Design a protein around this motif. Structure first.
Motif, PDB file in Angstrom:
ATOM      1  N   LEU C  19      49.950  28.039  38.124  1.00 41.22           N
ATOM      2  CA  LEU C  19      51.167  28.830  38.170  1.00 41.22           C
ATOM      3  C   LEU C  19      50.972  30.148  38.909  1.00 41.22           C
ATOM      4  O   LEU C  19      51.745  31.084  38.739  1.00 41.22           O
ATOM      5  CB  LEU C  19      51.678  29.088  36.744  1.00 41.22           C
ATOM      6  N   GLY C  20      49.925  30.212  39.723  1.00 34.98           N
ATOM      7  CA  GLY C  20      49.656  31.410  40.494  1.00 34.98           C
ATOM      8  C   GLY C  20      49.213  32.652  39.746  1.00 34.98           C
ATOM      9  O   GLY C  20      49.174  33.724  40.341  1.00 34.98           O
ATOM     10  N   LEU C  21      48.869  32.543  38.468  1.00 33.68           N
ATOM     11  CA  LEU C  21      48.449  33.734  37.744  1.00 33.68           C
ATOM     12  C   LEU C  21      47.743  33.462  36.423  1.00 33.68           C
ATOM     13  O   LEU C  21      47.442  34.389  35.676  1.00 33.68           O
ATOM     14  CB  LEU C  21      49.661  34.629  37.491  1.00 33.68           C
ATOM     15  N   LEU C  24      42.436  29.042  33.555  1.00 34.93           N
ATOM     16  CA  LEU C  24      42.139  28.177  32.423  1.00 34.93           C
ATOM     17  C   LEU C  24      40.639  27.974  32.269  1.00 34.93           C
ATOM     18  O   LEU C  24      39.941  27.725  33.254  1.00 34.93           O
ATOM     19  CB  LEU C  24      42.794  26.807  32.622  1.00 34.93           C
ATOM     20  N   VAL C  57      36.511  39.672  27.900  1.00 36.98           N
ATOM     21  CA  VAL C  57      35.859  38.533  27.257  1.00 36.98           C
ATOM     22  C   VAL C  57      36.376  37.189  27.762  1.00 36.98           C
ATOM     23  O   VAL C  57      37.417  37.119  28.417  1.00 36.98           O
ATOM     24  CB  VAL C  57      36.045  38.588  25.721  1.00 36.98           C
ATOM     25  N   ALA C  58      35.643  36.124  27.455  1.00 37.80           N
ATOM     26  CA  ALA C  58      36.036  34.783  27.871  1.00 37.80           C
ATOM     27  C   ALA C  58      37.347  34.373  27.194  1.00 37.80           C
ATOM     28  O   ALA C  58      37.783  35.004  26.228  1.00 37.80           O
ATOM     29  CB  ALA C  58      34.935  33.787  27.527  1.00 37.80           C
ATOM     30  N   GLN C  60      40.261  30.660  26.980  1.00 34.69           N
ATOM     31  CA  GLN C  60      40.726  29.367  27.477  1.00 34.69           C
ATOM     32  C   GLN C  60      41.918  29.511  28.426  1.00 34.69           C
ATOM     33  O   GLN C  60      42.194  28.611  29.216  1.00 34.69           O
ATOM     34  CB  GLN C  60      41.086  28.464  26.296  1.00 34.69           C
ATOM     35  N   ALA C  61      42.619  30.640  28.342  1.00 38.27           N
ATOM     36  CA  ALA C  61      43.768  30.908  29.213  1.00 38.27           C
ATOM     37  C   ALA C  61      44.026  32.405  29.287  1.00 38.27           C
ATOM     38  O   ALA C  61      44.343  33.042  28.281  1.00 38.27           O
ATOM     39  CB  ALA C  61      45.023  30.180  28.706  1.00 38.27           C
ATOM     40  N   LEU C  63      45.426  35.924  32.002  1.00 40.58           N
ATOM     41  CA  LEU C  63      46.199  36.350  33.159  1.00 40.58           C
ATOM     42  C   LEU C  63      45.170  36.770  34.223  1.00 40.58           C
ATOM     43  O   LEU C  63      44.378  37.695  34.003  1.00 40.58           O
ATOM     44  CB  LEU C  63      47.095  37.532  32.773  1.00 40.58           C
TER      45      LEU C  63
END
Ligand SMILES: CCCCCCCCCCCC[N+](C)(C)[O-]
Ligand SMILES: CCCCCCCCCCCC[N+](C)(C)[O-]
Ligand SMILES: CCCCCCCCCCCC[N+](C)(C)[O-]
Ligand SMILES: CCCCCCCCCCCC[N+](C)(C)[O-]
Ligand SMILES: CCCCCCCCCCCC[N+](C)(C)[O-]
Ligand SMILES: CCCCCCCCCCCC[N+](C)(C)[O-]
Ligand SMILES: CCCCCCCCCCCC[N+](C)(C)[O-]
Ligand SMILES: CCCCCCCCCCCC[N+](C)(C)[O-]
Ligand SMILES: CCCCCCCCCCCC[N+](C)(C)[O-]
Ligand SMILES: CCCCCCCCCCCC[N+](C)(C)[O-]
Ligand SMILES: CCCCCCCCCCCC[N+](C)(C)[O-]
Ligand SMILES: CCCCCCCCCCCC[N+](C)(C)[O-]
Ligand SMILES: CCCCCCCCCCCC[N+](C)(C)[O-]
Ligand SMILES: CCCCCCCCCCCC[N+](C)(C)[O-]
Ligand SMILES: CCCCCCCCCCCC[N+](C)(C)[O-]
Ligand SMILES: CCCCCCCCCCCC[N+](C)(C)[O-]
Ligand SMILES: CCCCCCCCCCCC[N+](C)(C)[O-]
Ligand SMILES: CCCCCCCCCCCC[N+](C)(C)[O-]
Ligand SMILES: CCCCCCCCCCCC[N+](C)(C)[O-]
Ligand SMILES: CCCCCCCCCCCC[N+](C)(C)[O-]
Ligand SMILES: [Zn+2]
Ligand SMILES: [Zn+2]
Ligand SMILES: [Zn+2]
Ligand SMILES: [Zn+2]
Lengths: 70, 70, 70, 70, 70, 70, 70, 70
Positions: C19-21, C24, C57-58, C60-61, C63
Motif C-alpha cells: 500500500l505504499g507505506l 510487513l 523496535v521490530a 509485524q506491521a 508505517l
C-alpha cells in the motif's frame, strides 16, 4: 465531537464491523448527532452501530474505528 | 503503557494469531496491566496471547500485532 | 544517515512493503549500516527490503517509507 | 497544488478507490495538473479517478484520499 | 418453508452478509415465521436481513444463503 | 453409529468449529465411540469437540457438522 | 441453463475476478441469457465478465466461478 | 475405473484439495489414464493432485474426493 479529528473523523451508522476496522453497509446518520450517547441512539434506530470512518459518504465497506462513549 | 500509540493501541488477550496480523478470540484483559510482564502473565491465565489490536472491544477476529514488551 | 530525520528515521529490514507505506514483518538490521548500499546489502541477506519506519523496535506491521538510497 | 501537504500528497490517477482510502491500479498523471477540475478531467481520459496517494510511484494498490474539488 | 431443506435450512436474522455466503451477527428470529415476506418483515424489525444458514444457533459468522421471496 | 450416513459421516475430534460447518485442527478419535455422549466425553479428554466430517483423515480444516446428541 | 446447479448457480456480470473465486462489482444481467454465447455477449455490453455466483442478487464482492459455456 | 462410480466419478487434476472435499483449479487430465498409477503420474506432470469430482468439465472449485489409488 462524536469522532476524533484526522483520518477516522466521519461519523456513520453501519450494519456491523469486521476485523476491528472495517464498517459494512454504512450510511451518514439520518439526523444530527451531538455526543457519544446520541450517536449510538440514532444508529440503533435502524439496528446499526456507531462508527467513525475515513469517508464522508455512504459505502458498503469502509475503514472505520469503533466510536468512543457510544 | 503496554501497546504503542496509534492504530494498534488496544491491549487484548487472544486465543491465537494468524498471518502475523489477525488475533482470534480476543477479549479485554480481566485486570489492569502496566507492562509487558503483567500483560503476558494476565493473558496466560486463560492460556491466551497478549496482542495489541485496532479495537478496544472484544471480538472473534481483529487486526492485531504481538505485544512488544511481552 | 540512512534514514531521513523525523518521522521515518528508524532503519529496518522488512519482508515487503504494501500500500505504499506499510512494512510487513520488520526487524532491526542484524549489522550496522552506514549508507544506502550497506542498508540494501544487509537486508538482502534475508531476502528482506530496506525501509525507514517510525518505530525503533521490530514489528509485524509498521508505517514505513522506502529507503532513500536503497 | 492539487493535493494537501503531508502523507497523502502525491497526485495519481487510479482505476478506483475501495474502503475509502485505497486506490487500485494507480499511475502518475500523464501531464501536469493545476487544480481540482483539471486533475479530474485528465484522469477521466483513461477512465480513472483523481486521488492523492502516499507514494509518488505507480502501484496496484496504494493508500489514497479523494482529491478535493475534483 | 422459509428456507430450503438440506445444509442451508436454518432461518436467521443477520446484520448483513458478505461474499454472498457469509452471514454476520446472526440470531434466530425473535418470533415464528411462516413465509418469505413475514420472515423479511420480522428481521427488518431490528434492521436485520433474512438468511438461511447451516446452523440452528446464533453466531457472529455463519455460512448462509440469501432467502427466497424475502 | 455416531454420524449420519453420507458426506458428513467421519467422526473427528476438533479443537473447534467456525462458520457452523468447518472444524479446525481435527483428528480421529483415539478410541472407538458408540453414541453421542460417549463421543463427546472422549473428545473432551483433549479439550476438543465432537464433529462429523467429510473425510476420515485428520486435517487442519475440514467441512464438519456438529454431532447429534453430543 | 448457463450456470451449473448447486452452490454457484447464479449468473452475474462482474467487472472482474480475483483468486479464481471472487467476482467484483457484480449485477444481474440486464436481459435473459440462454447459453454461454448470450451470457458472454450480454456482459460485454458493460465490459463485464460472465460469472456463476453463490448469490442471485448484485453485490460488490461475491464467491464466483467463470462461466463454463462462455 | 480410476474413479468410483456415482457422485465423484469424473477424474480431474487439481492444484490442491481443501477442507477435505473441494478441489481448486481443476482440469481434465491431459492424457488418458487407466489406473491409479497413471492418474497420479499424469497429474504430477503439472504439479497437480489427482481427484474424483462430480463435474465432467474443468472448474476453479469443485466438489471432489481424493483419488482411490493415488
Ligand atoms: C477484508 C478484505 C481482506 C483483503 C485481504 C487481501 C489479502 C491480499 C494478499 C496479497 C498477497 C500478495 N503476495 C504477492 C504477497 O502473495
Ligand atoms: C493493518 C496494517 C496497519 C498498519 C498500521 C500502521 C499504524 C502506524 C501508526 C503510526 C503512529 C506513528 N506515531 C509517530 C504517530 O506514533
Ligand atoms: C489499511 C489501514 C491503513 C491505516 C493507515 C494509517 C495511517 C496513519 C497515519 C497517522 C499519522 C499521525 N501523525 C500523528 C499524523 O503522524
Ligand atoms: C471464517 C474462517 C475463519 C478461519 C480461522 C482459522 C484460524 C486458524 C488458526 C490457526 C492457529 C495455529 N497456531 C499454531 C498459531 O495455533
Ligand atoms: C483492511 C483489512 C485487511 C486485512 C488484511 C489481511 C492481510 C493478510 C496478509 C497475509 C500475508 C502473508 N504473507 C505470507 C504473504 O506475508
Ligand atoms: C478476512 C481477510 C482474510 C485474509 C486472508 C489472507 C491469506 C493470505 C495467505 C498468504 C499465503 C502466502 N503463501 C506464500 C504462504 O502462499
Ligand atoms: C469478513 C470477515 C468475516 C469473518 C468471519 C470470521 C469468523 C471467525 C471465527 C473465529 C473463531 C475464533 N476462535 C478462537 C473462537 O476459534
Ligand atoms: C477472519 C479472519 C480469517 C483468517 C483466515 C486465516 C487463514 C490463514 C491460513 C494460513 C496458512 C499458513 N500455511 C503456512 C499453512 O500456509
Ligand atoms: C492489513 C494490511 C493488508 C495489506 C494487503 C496488501 C496487499 C498488497 C498486494 C500487493 C501486490 C503488489 N504487486 C506488485 C504484486 O501488484
Ligand atoms: C486491502 C488490500 C487489497 C489488495 C489488492 C491487491 C490487488 C493486486 C492485483 C494484482 C494484479 C496483477 N496483474 C498482473 C494481474 O495485473
Ligand atoms: C471470510 C474468511 C476468509 C478466509 C480466507 C482464508 C484464506 C486461506 C488461504 C490459505 C492458503 C494456504 N496455502 C498453503 C495455499 O498458501
Ligand atoms: C472458498 C474456499 C476457501 C478454502 C480455504 C481453504 C484454506 C485451506 C488451508 C489448508 C492448510 C492445509 N495445511 C496442510 C497446510 O495445514
Ligand atoms: C475458511 C478457511 C479457513 C482456513 C484455515 C486454515 C488454518 C491453517 C492453520 C495452519 C497451521 C499450521 N501450523 C504448522 C502452524 O500448525
Ligand atoms: C467456495 C468453495 C465452494 C465449493 C462449492 C462446491 C459446490 C458443489 C455443488 C455440487 C453439486 C453436485 N450435484 C451432483 C448435486 O450437481
Ligand atoms: C465453504 C462452502 C462449503 C460448501 C459445501 C457444499 C456441500 C454441498 C453438498 C451438496 C450435496 C447435494 N446432493 C444433492 C445432496 O449431492
Ligand atoms: C477490501 C479490499 C478489496 C480489494 C479488492 C482488490 C481487487 C483487485 C482486482 C485486480 C483485478 C486484476 N485483473 C487483471 C484481473 O483485472
Ligand atoms: C467462506 C469464505 C471463503 C473465502 C475464501 C477465499 C479463498 C481464497 C483462496 C486463494 C488461493 C490462492 N492460491 C494461489 C493459493 O491458490
Ligand atoms: C475476504 C477473503 C479474502 C481472502 C484473501 C485470500 C488471499 C490469498 C493469497 C494467496 C497468495 C498465494 N501466493 C502463492 C501467490 O503467495
Ligand atoms: C468481510 C468482507 C469485507 C469485504 C469488503 C469488500 C470491499 C469490496 C470493494 C469492491 C469494489 C469492486 N469494484 C469493482 C467496484 O472495484
Ligand atoms: C472482499 C474480497 C477481497 C479480495 C482481495 C483479493 C486480493 C488478491 C491479491 C492477488 C495478488 C496476486 N498476485 C499474483 C499479484 O500475488
Ligand atoms: Zn439526538
Ligand atoms: Zn509489572
Ligand atoms: Zn409473522
Ligand atoms: Zn444464444
Amino acid at each position: 465531537n462524536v469522532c476524533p479529528p484526522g483520518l477516522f473523523s466521519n461519523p456513520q451508522c453501519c450494519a456491523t464491523q469486521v476485523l476491528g476496522l472495517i464498517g459494512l453497509d454504512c450510511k451518514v446518520p439520518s439526523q444530527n448527532v451531538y455526543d457519544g450517547t446520541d450517536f449510538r441512539n440514532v444508529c440503533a434506530k435502524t439496528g446499526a452501530q456507531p462508527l467513525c470512518c475515513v469517508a464522508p459518504v455512504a459505502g458498503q465497506a469502509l475503514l472505520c474505528q469503533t466510536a468512543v462513549g457510544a
